[PDB]
Amino acid sequence: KAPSHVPFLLIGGGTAAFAAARSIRARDPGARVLIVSEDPELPYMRPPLSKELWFSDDPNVTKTLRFKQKERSIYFQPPSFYVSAQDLPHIENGGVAVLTGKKVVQLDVRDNMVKLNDGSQITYEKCLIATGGTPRSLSAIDRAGAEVKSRTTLFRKIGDFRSLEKISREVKSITIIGGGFLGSELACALGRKARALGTEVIQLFPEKGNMGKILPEYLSNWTMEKVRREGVKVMPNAIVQSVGVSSGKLLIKLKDGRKVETDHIVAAVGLEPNVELAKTGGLEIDSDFGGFRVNAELQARSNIWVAGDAACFYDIKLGRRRVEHHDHAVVSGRLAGENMTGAAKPYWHQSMFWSDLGPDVGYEAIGLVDSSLPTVGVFAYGKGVIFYLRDKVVVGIVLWNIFNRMPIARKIIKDGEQHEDLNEVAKLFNIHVLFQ
Ligand SMILES: Cc1cc2nc3c(=O)[nH]c(=O)nc-3n(C[C@H](O)[C@H](O)[C@H](O)COP(=O)(O)OP(=O)(O)OC[C@H]3O[C@@H](n4cnc5c(N)ncnc54)[C@H](O)[C@@H]3O)c2cc1C
Ligand SMILES: Cc1cc(N)c2cc(F)ccc2n1
């Protein structure tokens, strides 16, 4: 199936890879691009797996994988957009092929060659590593035994959505471990499903409130109350000590003495970059942020770039970073595709992210957003803007229930001005003052 040589080889078939393939085809007409994906699915976007796909009025949404934004599919393109790998060398004006169900297990940088899990070898001229990451798991779950492990979900892929959606219709109690984006969005989604069926949803995490690492405490606490009003039993300040099976149910023991009985656990406790290929490829990994260490142009070696969740890159403006946003995979993937066709451009356009936690909670963010940084919040906590500061300069912004204003927030961070009155800057977001 796979040819012996391809001009453009993209390792991994996710958001960053697809954005790169589209970018290469737009900058190099007739280009021949091969995506190698270990998943059986064609490239698709993940955000709907924790949001729109759970709020669809169509009960066949699990099969169609379409959602209302305007209806559209979770796949970036239908199969008709792609050509087969076997035909990729011969088709006139080239195309984009995806070799599904295949994993790159060896990378030879000196010879511009990869080896697949089935023994196949492919040489390339330009290569992109866009392997993303794998969900982390709790140490308490790893030591819990096979039964507990079989009743614990790591949420990332289409299969995880389908398996958890089926569970929410079969069991009475689901527990989410994790207070970040994924845990909070799944809590609101499972909470909506539970209100109609009369079932239970629990979310526990060690922080004082949802999104405690991202939002200031006062806004994290406000968010926790909104999640609770979606039908979720939220347990902050919860550290899992052990997990076992008791009378057929899962028993979660917390360090503080509390105990939670439930039927199924969803672990949403972060992501580990997929850097397996750094060993054979002799590629540098970043010990501080994780991931493949690349420069401002997302380049690792002469013919190898890295994009997406797995790329630790140099931001000429904000310093060295690694970002795990959908839009960042798109932006970095497209940038890598342009540099794979001679652009030599540095990461410059700042990617944004967003989150929706029910009807009354939606926010957008950009730049360095971290609750450890000093923050200034200007609210009208219905609507407002939170500025994240470093050396008296705005390095990140969170827009709370403010939409269609991201270009303004992007300009403020790019300009790097020293603002003496952030209340005037809040007027740019139609806000007419909390500190942390
Ligand atoms: C449920 C969910 C909801 C999200 N919601 C949001 C949101 O609302 N807003 C937001 O900004 N971000 C969101 N994100 C984050 C966003 O989806 C990620 O930042 C984005 O998918 C990262 O793109 P990627 O290409 O770097 O990685 P991935 O999408 O993970 O793609 C990597 C692909 O490469 C495959 N692969 C790995 N190693 C190999 C190998 N050796 N050989 C072959 N294939 C390999 C992996 O199987 C995977 O298929 C969400 C993520 C999830 C999981
Ligand atoms: C930056 C970001 C934003 C989100 N809304 C998000 C949601 C998820 F479910 C998982 C990861 C996420 N990462």
Numbering used by the authors: 127 to 195, 199 to 509, 560 to 611, 616 to 619
Show sentences the authors wrote.
A 60-kDa FAD-dependent oxidoreductase, AIF allosterically switches between two distinct redox states. NADH binding by the oxidized AIF monomer reduces its FAD cofactor at a centralized active site, allosterically disrupting hydrogen bond networks to release a 50-residue surface loop (C-loop) and stimulate dimerization at the AIF surface. Oxidized NAD+ and reduced FADH– form a long-lived charge-transfer complex (CTC), which stabilizes and maintains the reduced dimeric state of AIF. NADH-activated AIF dimers support import of OXPHOS subunits by CHCHD4 and are critical for mitochondrial function.
